[PDB]
Scaffold this active site. Structure first.
Site, PDB file in Angstrom:
ATOM      1  N   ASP A   1       0.824  -1.036  -0.078  1.00  0.00           N
ATOM      2  CA  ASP A   1      -0.168  -0.072   0.299  1.00  0.00           C
ATOM      3  C   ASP A   1       0.931   1.390  -0.029  1.00  0.00           C
ATOM      4  O   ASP A   1       1.327   1.653   0.945  1.00  0.00           O
ATOM      5  CB  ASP A   1      -0.817  -0.097   1.097  1.00  0.00           C
ATOM      6  N   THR A   2       0.809   1.697  -1.248  1.00  0.00           N
ATOM      7  CA  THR A   2       1.737   3.150  -1.287  1.00  0.00           C
ATOM      8  C   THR A   2       1.130   4.423  -0.356  1.00  0.00           C
ATOM      9  O   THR A   2       1.727   5.176  -0.174  1.00  0.00           O
ATOM     10  CB  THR A   2       2.027   3.422  -2.750  1.00  0.00           C
ATOM     11  N   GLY A   3      -0.106   4.176  -0.213  1.00  0.00           N
ATOM     12  CA  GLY A   3      -1.047   5.126   0.312  1.00  0.00           C
ATOM     13  C   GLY A   3      -0.812   5.266   1.886  1.00  0.00           C
ATOM     14  O   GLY A   3      -1.451   6.056   2.475  1.00  0.00           O
TER      15      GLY A   3
HETATM   16  C1  LIG Z   1      -6.936   6.932   2.743  1.00  0.00           C
HETATM   17  C2  LIG Z   1      -5.019   6.844   2.946  1.00  0.00           C
HETATM   18  C3  LIG Z   1      -4.333   8.236   2.647  1.00  0.00           C
HETATM   19  C4  LIG Z   1      -4.466   6.150   4.270  1.00  0.00           C
HETATM   20  N1  LIG Z   1      -5.126   4.743   4.074  1.00  0.00           N
HETATM   21  C5  LIG Z   1      -4.314   3.615   3.179  1.00  0.00           C
HETATM   22  C6  LIG Z   1      -5.271   3.420   2.007  1.00  0.00           C
HETATM   23  O1  LIG Z   1      -4.656   2.618   0.857  1.00  0.00           O
HETATM   24  C7  LIG Z   1      -6.475   2.643   2.295  1.00  0.00           C
HETATM   25  C8  LIG Z   1      -6.327   1.325   2.860  1.00  0.00           C
HETATM   26  C9  LIG Z   1      -7.336   0.337   3.212  1.00  0.00           C
HETATM   27  C10 LIG Z   1      -7.824  -0.585   2.100  1.00  0.00           C
HETATM   28  C11 LIG Z   1      -8.910  -1.491   2.423  1.00  0.00           C
HETATM   29  C12 LIG Z   1     -10.034  -1.000   3.620  1.00  0.00           C
HETATM   30  C13 LIG Z   1      -9.424  -0.147   4.399  1.00  0.00           C
HETATM   31  C14 LIG Z   1      -8.214   0.310   4.179  1.00  0.00           C
HETATM   32  N2  LIG Z   1      -7.478   2.722   1.347  1.00  0.00           N
HETATM   33  C15 LIG Z   1      -8.707   3.228   1.227  1.00  0.00           C
HETATM   34  O2  LIG Z   1      -9.063   3.722   2.123  1.00  0.00           O
HETATM   35  O3  LIG Z   1      -9.274   3.063   0.160  1.00  0.00           O
HETATM   36  C16 LIG Z   1     -10.662   3.151  -0.135  1.00  0.00           C
HETATM   37  C17 LIG Z   1     -11.006   3.751  -1.664  1.00  0.00           C
HETATM   38  O4  LIG Z   1     -10.845   2.809  -2.500  1.00  0.00           O
HETATM   39  C18 LIG Z   1     -11.676   1.699  -1.476  1.00  0.00           C
HETATM   40  O5  LIG Z   1     -10.918   0.665  -1.647  1.00  0.00           O
HETATM   41  C19 LIG Z   1     -10.390   0.160  -0.347  1.00  0.00           C
HETATM   42  C20 LIG Z   1     -11.067   0.759   0.852  1.00  0.00           C
HETATM   43  C21 LIG Z   1     -11.503   2.161  -0.182  1.00  0.00           C
HETATM   44  S1  LIG Z   1      -5.375   4.191   5.704  1.00  0.00           S
HETATM   45  O6  LIG Z   1      -5.971   2.643   5.504  1.00  0.00           O
HETATM   46  O7  LIG Z   1      -6.400   4.867   6.308  1.00  0.00           O
HETATM   47  C22 LIG Z   1      -3.859   4.066   6.508  1.00  0.00           C
HETATM   48  C23 LIG Z   1      -3.600   5.240   7.302  1.00  0.00           C
HETATM   49  C24 LIG Z   1      -2.670   5.212   8.160  1.00  0.00           C
HETATM   50  C25 LIG Z   1      -1.373   4.033   7.954  1.00  0.00           C
HETATM   51  N3  LIG Z   1      -0.273   4.291   8.950  1.00  0.00           N
HETATM   52  C26 LIG Z   1      -1.923   2.966   7.258  1.00  0.00           C
HETATM   53  C27 LIG Z   1      -3.089   3.023   6.533  1.00  0.00           C
END
Ligand SMILES: CC(C)CN(C[C@@H](O)[C@H](Cc1ccccc1)NC(=O)O[C@H]1CO[C@H]2OCC[C@H]21)S(=O)(=O)c1ccc(N)cc1
EC number: 3.4.23.16
Lengths: 99, 99
Positions: A25-27
């Site tokens: 996860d690059t995000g």
């Molecule tokens: C929103 C980002 C700036 C940060 N996130 C990583 C991100 O990749 C999350 C990672 C993620 C992935 C799945 C479920 C929850 C979180 N993906 C996400 O929220 O995606 C949403 C939009 O597309 C959909 O697909 C997945 C969820 C939806 S995060 O999960 O909240 C996060 C925040 C801080 C840390 N240290 C680690 C992870």
């Protein structure tokens, strides 16, 4: 290897003598893993994203093997809906985005 | 280009004739941008992240240029903590993970 993004970039990791599946996860600034009972001390932390924040336990200098690539660093443990390998460890395995 | 992950993979995007900064997010299935005015029809939808679910406006077939690469696809607009480019558009610009 090269991983395309047609599907979620899920890989097998090894942490604390256990195998799990996690997203590359690059995000994610930092690696966050599902609830697991790691030994050692930890520090409380809250991490935020879409939907708000969750409370996690911050373990430092944790060894993780990602596709046979070894890394050691911060691992946050908490009620996350998914396991994500964040940039703090992706850098250590030489992972880049390419287009 | 090849992007390392020592810092957040932030890039400049062009959407609706406006420049914005956004995070290349391999852990996002979908693309979610902060509140903005977008020309076009939209439908309300729900999207879930690490902290729960939020209400977004779904815009389909939107032109968006990411670091000089054109994509046309779904963009969700709502109270995300940061603009994230998800896999639905990363695939279009030919983005892969490599290590
Ligand atoms: C929103 C980002 C700036 C940060 N996130 C990583 C991100 O990749 C999350 C990672 C993620 C992935 C799945 C479920 C929850 C979180 N993906 C996400 O929220 O995606 C949403 C939009 O597309 C959909 O697909 C997945 C969820 C939806 S995060 O999960 O909240 C996060 C925040 C801080 C840390 N240290 C680690 C992870």
């Amino acid at each position: 290897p090269q991983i395309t993004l047609w599907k979620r970039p899920l890989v097998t990791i090894k942490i604390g003598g256990q195998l799990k599946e996690a997203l590359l996860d690059t995000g994610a600034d930092d690696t966050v893993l599902e609830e697991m009972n790691l030994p050692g001390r930890w520090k409380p932390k809250m991490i935020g994203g879409i939907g708000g924040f969750i409370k996690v336990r911050q373990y430092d200098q944790i060894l993780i093997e990602i596709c046979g690539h070894k890394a050691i660093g911060t691992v946050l443990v908490g009620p996350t809906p998914v396991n994500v390998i964040g940039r703090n460890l992706l850098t250590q395995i030489g992972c880049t985005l390419n287009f």
